[PDB]
């Protein structure tokens, strides 16, 4: 029975499972009661994503720009998503990692998976949280990197300044 | 009347709440139904700033240290809070940052209140992701600072595949 191995891992001593079990039994089962935001931080990285003002705020434009790459990376992401899991392989992340094109060694987009991942598997919202933060990092590097040598000097103040803004 | 501007805040055009509105009425009001856990990501960035192997786990030691570490940012919160809401203004984070030992600018202070206030104050939590964070940042700067010069030439890679950790 299917449904036995999801049971037999929340159940306690007695062999049955109360309200708090059940409602762990379920989610795993696949019924879920809702759909839920964005995390906060997520949405803190969107923000910086796209704020050129520095104002900590986004615009209309912004948003209608930040909507469609959105939507793209779901698309993408139901696309892969072969259960409905809601989750994808850490191996999948790397893949779409690579696919941006900022020229990031082996060594460094493994490692970057490896934080993202809830129990060798990553969810929708670590994904998108991953994939915007490589994006606003790589831009504000790149507004530093004014010679294009792929190298920063970096005084402690800006690059605190820096990476505490993304 | 005290509490008549918690009320007008939510209520609709005809002087009445829904239990939806109530809901976050009595919040700012000054009851909260109980404590919630650290967000996920400020317990990544706890487990980031002890990891000394690249494991992405915490050891028992590290735990210790950790809730002693933890225990003494609250004490020193609560302090400055007097009020307990367990919201903190920027002012009082600037404050706070100097104590714990940080040279940090005020450009420096004023992207982390951007980043880590809303409505126009910062949460317990985002206080100590904001705290973690800074330690744990400063030590990947500090750890390639020879010479103690407090400049850092940083490659892209190393760069991304180290702020990324964190």
Same mark, same amino acid.
């Not at 994503?49 to 992401?77: C, I, P, Y």
């Not at 970057?112 to 998108?128: E, H, M, V």
């Given at each position: 029975?299917?449904?036995?191995?999801?049971?037999?891992?929340?159940?306690?001593?007695?062999?049955?499972?109360?309200?708090?079990?059940?409602?762990?039994? $379920?989610?795993?089962?696949?019924?879920?009661?809702?759909?839920?935001?964005?995390? $906060? *931080?997520?949405?803190?990285? !969107?923000?910086?994503?796209?704020?050129?003002?520095?104002?900590?705020? !986004?615009?209309?434009?912004?948003?209608?720009?930040?909507?469609?790459? $959105?939507?793209?990376?779901?698309?993408? &992401?139901?696309?892969?998503?072969?259960?409905?899991?809601?989750?994808?392989?850490?191996? *999948?992340?790397?893949?779409?990692?690579?696919? !941006?094109? &900022?020229?990031?060694?082996?060594?460094?987009?493994?490692?970057?998976?490896?934080?993202?991942?809830?129990?060798?598997?990553?969810?929708?919202?670590?994904?998108?949280?991953?994939?915007?933060?490589?994006?606003? $990092?790589?831009?504000?590097?790149?507004?530093?990197?004014?010679?294009?040598?792929?190298?920063?000097?970096?005084?402690?103040?800006? &690059?605190?300044?820096?990476? !505490?803004?993304?």
């Amino acid at each position: 029975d299917p449904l036995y191995g999801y049971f037999a891992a929340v159940a306690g001593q007695d062999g049955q499972i109360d309200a708090d079990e059940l409602q762990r039994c $379920l989610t795993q089962s696949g019924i879920a009661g809702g759909y839920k935001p964005f995390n $906060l *931080e997520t949405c803190r990285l !969107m923000v910086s994503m796209l704020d050129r003002d520095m104002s900590g705020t !986004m615009g209309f434009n912004e948003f209608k720009e930040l909507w469609a790459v $959105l939507n793209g990376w779901r698309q993408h &992401f139901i696309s892969l998503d072969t259960d409905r899991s809601g989750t994808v392989d850490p191996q *999948e992340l790397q893949k779409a990692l690579t696919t !941006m094109g &900022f020229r990031l060694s082996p060594q460094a987009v493994n490692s970057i998976a490896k934080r993202y991942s809830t129990n060798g598997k990553i969810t929708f919202d670590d994904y998108i949280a991953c994939c915007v933060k490589l994006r606003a $990092l790589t831009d504000s590097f790149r507004r530093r990197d004014t010679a294009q040598q792929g190298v920063v000097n970096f005084p402690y103040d800006d &690059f605190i300044q820096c990476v !505490m803004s993304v």
